[PDB]
Design a protein around this ligand. Sequence first.
Ligand code: 50P
Ligand code: NI
Ligand code: ZN
Ligand code: ZN
Length: 577
Amino acid sequence: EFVPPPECPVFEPSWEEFTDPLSFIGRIRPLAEKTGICKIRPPKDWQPPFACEVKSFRFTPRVQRLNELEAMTRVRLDFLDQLAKFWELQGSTLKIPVVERKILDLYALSKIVASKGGFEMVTKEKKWSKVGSRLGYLPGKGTGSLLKSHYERILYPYELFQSGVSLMGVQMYTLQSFGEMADNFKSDYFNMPVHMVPTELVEKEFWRLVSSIEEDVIVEYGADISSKDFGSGFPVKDGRRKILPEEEEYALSGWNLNNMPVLEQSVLAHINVDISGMKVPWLYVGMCFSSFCWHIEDHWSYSINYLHWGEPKTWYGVPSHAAEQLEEVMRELAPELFESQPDLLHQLVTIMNPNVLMEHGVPVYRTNQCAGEFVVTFPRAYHSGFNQGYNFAEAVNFCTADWLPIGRQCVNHYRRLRRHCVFSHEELIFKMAADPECLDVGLAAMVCKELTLMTEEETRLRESVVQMGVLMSEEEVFELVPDDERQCSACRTTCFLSALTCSCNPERLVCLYHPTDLCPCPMQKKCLRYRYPLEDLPSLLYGVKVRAQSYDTWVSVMLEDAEDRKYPENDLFRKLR
Ligand SMILES: CC(C)c1c(-c2ccccc2)[nH]c2c(C#N)cnn2c1=O
Ligand code: NI
Ligand SMILES: [Zn+2]
Ligand SMILES: [Zn+2]
């Protein structure tokens, strides 16, 4: 009944194209960008060894119920719609809390609490820990007594209201043993050898099970796992191992996902600055039917994914130009509710069958990732998928010259939602501009174009705030203060270039895009806390414009300077020799 979408393109690069990944991805960008994802087959000779032992590799498995994997179900949306309207009426506003890294599922929580007789029934019987368990929450972290605090503050008033009448007060595993699991599950399900069941068939049965309430199918995966903590599946040199000469090649390879962030065309390179949270790969161990819902990467940008081994991983891509369009059809499901909770759209996980996105006009491509293959995900390309059987994958995010302007556009969208930024985009740009040499000329060029847009935009914000009646101007070093203390009162964005402080709070802050929301305090005295005085314009635009236009003239001892300045080659250098 399910229809496989069009295949996304694969690239089988020569050993010479395979030498720089970020050059090859640029080569391919104008094309693969249109499918939103692409697959990359390294040369068959390229087979890096698997660093990790398996027999002892211990991870904590998470769980997925494919029946309830979909959070955008009709019932959950009308509940949350009705709950928000309720609170709106009460003068408050519905604010959905986060519990253990992710949003609290109120519909589940409310259902469960009410099935055992409600708040004071669960309280007096101390079953709140039983609840959080059935809600999928990891013990013994005390989530139980935390949910009670949340239910009361949020669901109890609605419980009363919805309940009869009422409502007066008050108010305001081992990788080895995992393979044994996943190979046993799959064979007993399809009654074949696990390697013998065709991709098309598992893909069909997967989407069947999602919309199928006639049967429950539970599955285990593991993720939120780092190279830092558990170690990379790749060889690489830090202190912990003598590296074998057989491995020496692959340890240094640019396709080793440990090395990508530091490649000269990567942004997270020479900045010796801060943790972005993606300079380091993550690990996904997977089963048959294990899935990952529709999503884009933080700050959009790129993700590359190597399947080290095991049965294949199915992907569904969407172009970056279809992104607004994608978000729009999902929004059609609760327009009133998504108005009040703009970011709740992203917060709610969904696997919307590609078939449904297709008939709404959204391009959806796909592919089967087979062991030893790379998948690249382009900026703001929505992706999702599932695993065919037992496997082990490794992925990192990254950023490139072409991304920079997208990254700025992302903050602006993260600013128009209420969304915490995982770092400051503008801070990044200046850290790059502050070391113009030994910076890829691609970046430098793009930086100038991108920085001049900020200087203008900032000066507009710097002169717009004085009309508002601020006088005093302090000077702070923002990068050195923790991210959550440099946020904006309601934005909520990380400030670098400038912000506004009053005496209403010793530290509470607002970016120049929302000056009126700081406090009721009249303009009167101060305080515009800035970073650079406007002596920045000549200074930093110079250093970057230097190496930017030094290369422009050089193309228009000449093969020496290119080696000293670390110019790229391909192309031009070929004519040289
Ligand atoms: C099944 C699970 C281990 C999984 C998740 C995943 C894990 C936990 C929560 C959400 C997704 N994400 C991803 C991506 C991406 N992007 C690629 N593969 N992949 C996975 O296999
Ligand atoms: Ni992803
Ligand atoms: Zn703001
Ligand atoms: Zn004030």
